Amino acid sequence: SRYVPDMGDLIWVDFDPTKGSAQAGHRPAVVLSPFMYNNKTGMCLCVPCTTQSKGYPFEVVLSGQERDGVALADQVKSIAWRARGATKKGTVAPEELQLIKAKINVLIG
Amino acid sequence: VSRYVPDMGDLIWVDFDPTKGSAQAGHRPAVVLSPFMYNNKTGMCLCVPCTTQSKGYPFEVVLSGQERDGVALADQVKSIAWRARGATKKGTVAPEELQLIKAKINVLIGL
Numbered sequence: 001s002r003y004v005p006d007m008g009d010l011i012w013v014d015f016d017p018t019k020g021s022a023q024a025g026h027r028p029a030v031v032l033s034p035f036m037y038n039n040k041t042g043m044c045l046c047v048p049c050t051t052q053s054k055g056y057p058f059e060v061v062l063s064g065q066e067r068d069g070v071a072l073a074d075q076v077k078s079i080a081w082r083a084r085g086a087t088k089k090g091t092v093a094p095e096e097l098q099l100i101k102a103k104i105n106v107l108i109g
Numbered sequence: 110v111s112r113y114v115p116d117m118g119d120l121i122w123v124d125f126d127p128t129k130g131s132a133q134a135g136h137r138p139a140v141v142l143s144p145f146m147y148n149n150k151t152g153m154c155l156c157v158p159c160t161t162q163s164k165g166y167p168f169e170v171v172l173s174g175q176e177r178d179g180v181a182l183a184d185q186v187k188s189i190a191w192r193a194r195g196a197t198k199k200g201t202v203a204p205e206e207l208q209l210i211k212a213k214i215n216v217l218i219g220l
């Protein structure tokens with residue numbers, strides 16, 4: 001019984017050791033794609049989170065989580081969740097997932 | 110001189126993922142999904158990568174042109190810092206090709 005991400009999961013992935021980031025491991029993300037796709041492909045679409053808001057319009061506030069952070073809705077990316085050590089830390093509020101998706105929807109159409 | 114700003118539906122040549130792969134196959138084509146105003150203002154764009162080799166995967170969208178067909182990998186959306194990493198324009202996809210790419214993404218993250 002290994003974890004497979006589902007939509008709305010707040011996940012931590014290991015930082016990418018090839019990027020040369022000064023920040024330690026653990027990059028938080030919100031999973032957008034559904035379990036069936038994630039499970040059959042080993043990939044998922046997700047948006048990265050940051051603890052520090054800057055007041056940019058695609059930021060979505062995530063409340064109630066262990067820490068206060070924001071999802072960056074415009075920064076959608078496909079990740080190989082297996083290879084990135086995805087671990088579920090929590091779930092975002094349905095209103096928060098919905099808002100992330102709405103912003104992306106408007107951006108892509 | 111001003112830099113080319115990717116527009117929605119453009120096919121760009123971009124260093125798609127410099128941290129990985131070879132320095133010979135690093136630059137690849139990508140289809141731009143986000144609107145001009147966003148791309149211009151932010152220096153970023155959402156795009157999907159293209160490949161020369163189809164495999165019959167369900168998120169492949171055929172790109173048909175006057176020189177060698179390709180496929181866009183519609184589920185592999187990525188945000189790219191086009192302004193910082195450099196992007197150049199290779200062409201523009203058909204309205205129908207862009208529409209199919211977006212319909213496929215809609216399956217995964219729409220509503």
Ligand code: NA
Pocket residue numbers: 110111112
């Ligand atoms: Na310029």
